[PDB]
């Protein structure tokens, strides 16, 4: 009911899960998927195969809105971060460009004890 036909796809990859959001060129999302959106529940979400399916689940949902051109945005280190991208390129959606925007602080916030 939109027919954007082009936009941006954001990949958020953490070690506990990978989730994909698909937006129109000004950034407002259209459809999305995750490791939990597909059947996986636990640590299986952090697997690259989950990232592969989550990418394809989101890609197919974007097809329903007519998406053809896709600019890829990647945020975070994690398994299937790459496997999510390689699933996007062969999803049928033409990948316009790939950019790594992962937010890195300038040492502003004290991390949790886990990260020190």
């Amino acid at each position: 009911k939109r027919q954007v036909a082009s936009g941006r796809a954001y990949i958020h990859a953490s070690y506990n899960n990978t989730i994909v959001t698909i937006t129109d060129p000004d950034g407002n999302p259209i459809t999305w998927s995750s490791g939990g959106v597909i059947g996986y529940k636990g640590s299986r979400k952090g697997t690259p195969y989950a990232a592969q399916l989550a990418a394809l689940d989101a890609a197919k949902k974007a097809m329903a809105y007519g998406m053809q051109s896709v600019d890829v945005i990647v945020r975070g280190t994690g398994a299937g971060r790459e496997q999510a991208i390689r699933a996007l390129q062969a999803s049928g959606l033409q990948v316009k460009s790939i950019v790594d925007d992962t937010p890195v602080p300038h040492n502003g916030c004290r991390p949790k004890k886990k990260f020190r």
């Binding site: 299986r44 697997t47 690259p48 195969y49 989950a50 398994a79």
Partner: protein, 155 residues
């Protein structure tokens, strides 16, 4: 084999079909070192498959073996506590032994009374896509593509 490659034994060609795949299969049938018994079973079973079906028992034997060959299986690998079922390809040598063993094992689960009757019928079913040997093959190929989430553990 910690040291060498453990070279494969070279079986004698068959006395009848001159084929090594037949001699290896006859061995899988042999029990307690009675090869004369095993060959008579396998060769009489060639009569059953060549009469009740009008094709070459040579070609059906190969056709039955090819259908039981699994392309993928699962293996266990210890990772962070309890291990996992890890899918991976099957060596062409391993596809040799597995299909033959499954064919002989499945034929002895058959109803038929006499041995050669079970073998011929199993080979006939296996060649047609059905039969107990193909079920084991299909069930293994189901283990792969199921734990396919662990395809990053290939090793």
């Amino acid at each position: 084999a910690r040291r060498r490659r453990a070279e494969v034994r070279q079986l004698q060609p068959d006395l009848v079909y001159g084929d090594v795949l037949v001699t290896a299969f006859i061995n899988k049938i042999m029990r307690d070192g009675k090869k004369n018994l095993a060959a008579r079973i396998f060769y009489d079973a060639c009569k059953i498959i060549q009469e009740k079906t009008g094709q070459e028992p040579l070609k059906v034997f190969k056709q039955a073996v090819e259908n039981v060959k699994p392309r993928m299986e699962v293996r266990s690998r210890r990772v962070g506590g309890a291990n996992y079922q890890v899918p991976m390809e099957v060596s062409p040598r391993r596809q040799q032994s597995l299909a033959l063993r499954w064919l002989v094992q499945a034929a002895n689960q058959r109803p038929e009374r006499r041995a050669a009757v079970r073998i011929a019928h199993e080979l006939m079913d296996a060649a047609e896509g059905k039969g107990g040997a193909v079920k084991k093959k299909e069930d293994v190929e189901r283990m792969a593509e199921a734990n396919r989430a662990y395809a990053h553990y290939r090793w």
